[PDB]
Design a protein around this ligand. Structure first.
Ligand SMILES: *C(=O)[C@@H](C)NC(=O)c1ccccc1
Ligand SMILES: [Cl-]
Ligand SMILES: [Cl-]
Lengths: 468, 469
């Protein structure tokens, strides 16, 4: 007689007990953590690896008591998501075995989880790849941990230049991206669309050199990272996250920089009217509104450029109308292709997606670029068939507090006079608008104008520029 | 008493696009027959009064005689194609007005035309964009007139290097691609996938420099080009073609270099069963089998690299199995975006496609990249549902006659001893197999290893080669 229900109150199951489906265990486990804090607090503790007596009590309270447990799960969307993974799951198998999958669909204004995919098939495997397994987010780390923070601290703007010239780790090893040692200077947009690694590495070093509390940012979105003094951290080195938590970081970018904590339980009510737990809205401005809406604009291009994912193309062919909603996203690829991530938002929703194997062995080279992008387009279509207005028709837009600068294409700073080789120069050339999240906008071009680069790099780029 | 039929004898009509197109070709064939019958001949044929008299006689024969006309059209494929453009034609519209379209499906072993799309909707607009419209094929011309010819003449192979360093036309204007003046050296594979312009320009110039008979190659495919002395010829300048004729040129690459002449008419038969006209197969080896099969491997990557078309992604979402056929293809885009082209083949079929506006105004930037790719993936899929074996599952494959070479990745040539600004150098580094269509494969590396390039260009490039040993 204790009960778990969908957001509209329809029963999911009753809870009982015995001695010897993803939806059931996920929602029960979150309901038990809610019951525990409630119990711990009503007996005024804060003491203790028992504990652990409170876990057991919370399970008993729910399996004996008569409690109504309201979830955020939308029955139609969640069922459509199961049918999707059942009908199009095979799209992910790439010749490397049975490829597993995790997907969380989150509401950007509230943090509520509308539906999810726990895996390919509960009966054949029960690991919950939406809420339990933790893998490096790799590249999908770079907007949250490196570029979004640098934009937020007034250290760069949308058309800032970064170095992708070859450079080494402190140990001598060259920093790589697939087989490439590096190219030269590029925009942010290019560093993002292609997902290069050297530009994120220099951004994070800048942040450290300037004393940015990067930990403060990540903690406010609930990320737990044990060691920040890692050179590859912007590449996802030393980080490991569930699909649900990571979706929650993209929710933050999509919601104009304002976090709401992910949840699957909204209310726990006793048969006697005692409300044991109700979700409190607790919004947190993590990035300014200028930062987040600037970041949205870049992530729009990461998908429309198709450089690292075929998603827009796949979705165009399945549902050209849905494909013209305002989609933004980032992909991620682990160093041996062990894990592929694709994160998508419209202004209303965020959908996180991971694929990999349980034993961590390698996927094919294109599992992320192609298989996962195509499977996710199917899943996005399904959610839509079930709830045709849930993705929303609104567009992401720059906040009015965003600051505009006219800069040069070649330096991403204002045109101006710099001294090169001792001998002076007047720099000019084709220009562009770059967006900033400070008061003053972009600076005037100085000698070292980009994020990173050795002296030899700057001498090579400066030279080619004065090729005017 | 006169009738037109599908290839299976089923009756088309008594003698919409389908009707006029096939009537018109039959009339063409009848004219030819009347003219030879009355032994008219030659300069007399150029007179327009007599031209008029014979057209009028051809037409009247067809309504008067009781001629049985059998066409190459597969009824089921053709209607699927008609349904497809009715259902999916809207995918092409892009905010530049209503976009027209032409498609021709051709059997690669016979040159027969199985079906076609004349336009968005005959009742609204009656111009036939498969058979009558002529527009520059743009990029789409590079594989045929630049790179395929050069490979066939022994002047390059699959990983030959070509210059895409900025350069100017003879009048001093720079050769552009989008808004880029160009980059540096690059392989043929990358020149083809991204569709750069400067490499095609140097290839053609080289063929002029070796006196290659390019006109001879184009004429064997039935191409009519009034003037070959044009610097932008291999980009498609000074060429305008119908969809049907251009399909025929990609038919030739697809059929291992051997052309068959396009046609929707296979036979016309007099009331009493004698043959006024019947199609006579005349295959011509236009490219060596080594050339065309090397081209096939290159055009495979144009599609699967997805740089200029999203086609393989679209097809993959509509039909994962059909996407695993062995597709090869090339896109093209006019200056200013007035015409887009996507040409596709499996070993059995070629499908040509054009989109654009009847008064030539610009399409949007992505109209070829995304729209026409998506629309063509739907058309391809409708063909499959209507005739499930038709595309086939065979693979293109290098002909035994192809020579392989191990060349330096960075020169496109055999590793070796090279003289650089005085000091001789030993040139080494990673290698790769390059395919050639001559007797001896690839030569040894020499100072001008690439197609095209200035001295300043070469002093840049060697800088890198050397600084990397
Ligand atoms: C981050 O992990 C980087 C290296 N890039 C990608 O997300 C990616 C994904 C798929 C194909 C190419 C690159
Ligand atoms: Cl492919
Ligand atoms: Cl694509």
């Amino acid at each position: 007689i204790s009960e778990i229900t969908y957001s509209d109150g329809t029963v999911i199951a009753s809870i009982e007990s015995d001695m010897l489906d993803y939806l059931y265990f996920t929602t029960l486990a979150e309901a038990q953590e809610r019951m525990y804090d409630y119990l711990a607090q009503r007996d005024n503790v804060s003491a203790e690896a028992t504990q652990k007596f409170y876990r057991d009590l919370a399970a008993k309270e729910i399996e004996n008591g008569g409690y109504k447990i309201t979830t955020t799960i939308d029955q139609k969307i969640h069922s459509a998501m199961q049918s999707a993974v059942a009908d199009y799951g095979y799209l992910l198998d790439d010749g490397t075995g049975r490829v597993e999958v995790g997907n969380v669909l989150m509401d950007n204004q509230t943090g509520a989880i509308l539906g999810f995919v726990g895996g390919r098939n509960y009966q054949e495997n029960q690991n919950n790849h939406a809420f339990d397994t933790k893998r490096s987010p790799a590249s999908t780390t770079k907007p949250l941990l490196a570029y979004g923070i640098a934009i937020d601290q007034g250290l760069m703007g949308s058309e800032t230049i970064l170095s992708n010239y070859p450079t080494n780790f402190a140990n001598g090893n060259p920093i790589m991206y697939a087989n490439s040692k590096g190219t030269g200077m590029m925009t942010l947009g290019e560093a993002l669309n292609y997902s290069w690694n050297i530009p994120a590495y220099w951004t994070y070093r800048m942040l450290r050199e300037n004393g940015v509390d990067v930990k403060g940012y990540m903690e406010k979105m609930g990320y737990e990272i044990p060691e920040y003094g890692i050179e590859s951290l912007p590449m996802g080195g030393g980080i490991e996250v569930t699909v649900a938590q990571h979706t929650n970081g993209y929710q933050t970018l999509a919601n104009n920089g304002v976090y709401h904590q992910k949840h699957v339980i909204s209310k726990i009510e006793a048969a006697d009217g005692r409300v044991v737990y109700e979700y409190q809205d607790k919004p947190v401005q993590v990035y300014s509104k200028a930062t987040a809406t600037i970041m949205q604009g870049l992530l729009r291009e990461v998908l429309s450029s198709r450089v690292t994912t075929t998603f827009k193309s796949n979705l165009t062919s399945l549902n050209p109308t849905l494909a013209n909603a305002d989609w933004i996203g980032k992909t991620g690829t682990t160093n041996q292709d062990e894990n592929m991530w694709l994160m998508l938002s419209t202004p209303r929703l965020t959908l996180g997606g991971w694929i990999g194997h349980d034993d961590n062995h390698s996927l094919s080279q294109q599992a992320g670029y192609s298989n996962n992008s195509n499977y996710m387009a199917h899943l996005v279509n399904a959610i839509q068939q079930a709830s045709p207005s849930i993705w929303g028709n609104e567009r992401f837009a720059l906040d009015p507090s965003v600051v505009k600068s006219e800069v040069l294409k070649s330096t991403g700073q204002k045109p101006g006079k710099v001294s090169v080789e001792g001998k002076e120069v007047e720099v000019t050339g084709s220009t562009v608008t770059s967006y900033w999240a400070n008061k003053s906008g972009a600076p005037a071009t100085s000698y070292r104008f980009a994020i990173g680069g050795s002296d030899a790099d700057y001498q090579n780029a400066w030279s080619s520029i004065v090729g005017s």
